């Protein structure tokens, strides 16, 4: 019972990279997941430099709600930023991962998410916090959950390179070789 092979739709999802990029890399991730924190800091920047910057890869992130209330809070904030200030999205996204502590207990609060909105985006802290309380963007989180279920996501992060499921998100050799093989095929 593993993640399913196939190309996940990135329609309506956050995207980084050129429209015409031949390879689509999708991360199914959770802002509270410590392995997603590692992916963010250690692996993603290499995909950026090696492929996204040169137009070979377009990258997308889909929310997965594996760590309870705080995962949902963070996802709702993330969805609002993508809608209201997409040019700032990836700055907010990276800084939220950077804020994840190496401790077990809950850490995600409206206050915390407001502060990030303030430092990285055009969006007003009180606006974001109002929408979190109202769960204004709930439909987007449910959309992501539907997609997660469709793809049978088991653990975060799960990385797709076109229709190929990466076995180890932390193995840059696997990711790089798989990107390169998909590029060749295109
Ligand atoms: Ca989404």
Please tell me the distance between residue 49's alpha carbon and the centre of ligand 1 in angstroms.
24
Q: What is the dihedral of CA 26, 90, 81, 7, to 10 degrees?
A: -10
Experiment type: X-ray
Can you give the CATH number for the domain in which 154 is found? 3.40.30.10
Distance between Cα 62 and ligand 1 center (Å): 5
Span from the CA of 23 to the centroid of ligand 1 (angstroms): 19
Domain span at residue 40 reads: 1-186
Distances (CA, A) of 2 to 154, 167, 168, 186: 7, 10, 13, 26
Beta-carbon neighbours within 5 Å of ion ligand 1: 13, 144
Q: How does DSSP assign 31-95, residue by residue?
A: TT-HHHHHIIIIIHHHHIIIIITTTSEEEEEEE---STHHHHHHHHHHHHHHHH-GGGHHHHHHH
Q: Measured in angstroms, how far is the CA atom of residue 12 from the centroid of ligand 1?
A: 7
Q: How far is the CA of 30 from the centre of ligand 1 (A)?
A: 11
Q: Å resolution of this model?
A: 1.5
Place of tokens 């407001």: 114
Domain count, the chain: 1
Cα–Cα dist 157/160, whole Å = 10
């Amino acid at each position: 019972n593993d993640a399913v092979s196939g190309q996940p739709s990135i329609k309506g999802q956050p995207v980084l990279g050129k429209d015409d990029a031949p390879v689509t890399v999708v991360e199914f991730g959770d802002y509270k997941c410590p392995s997603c924190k590692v992916f963010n800091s250690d692996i993603f920047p290499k995909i950026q430099k090696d492929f996204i910057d040169k137009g070979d890869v377009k990258f997308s992130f889909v929310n997965v709600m594996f760590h309870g209330k705080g995962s949902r809070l963070a996802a709702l904030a993330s969805e609002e930023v993508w809608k209201e200030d997409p040019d700032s999205f990836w700055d907010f996204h990276e800084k939220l991962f950077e804020k994840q502590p190496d401790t077990e207990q809950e850490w995600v609060t409206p206050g915390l998410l407001g502060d990030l909105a303030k430092s990285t985006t055009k969006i007003k802290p009180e606006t974001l916090k109002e929408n979190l309380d109202k769960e204004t963007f709930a439909s987007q989180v449910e959309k992501d959950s539907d997609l997660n279920q469709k793809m049978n996501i088991q653990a975060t992060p799960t990385i797709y390179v076109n229709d190929k499921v990466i076995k180890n998100f932390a193995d840059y050799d696997e990711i790089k070789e798989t990107i390169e093989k998909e590029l060749k095929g295109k």
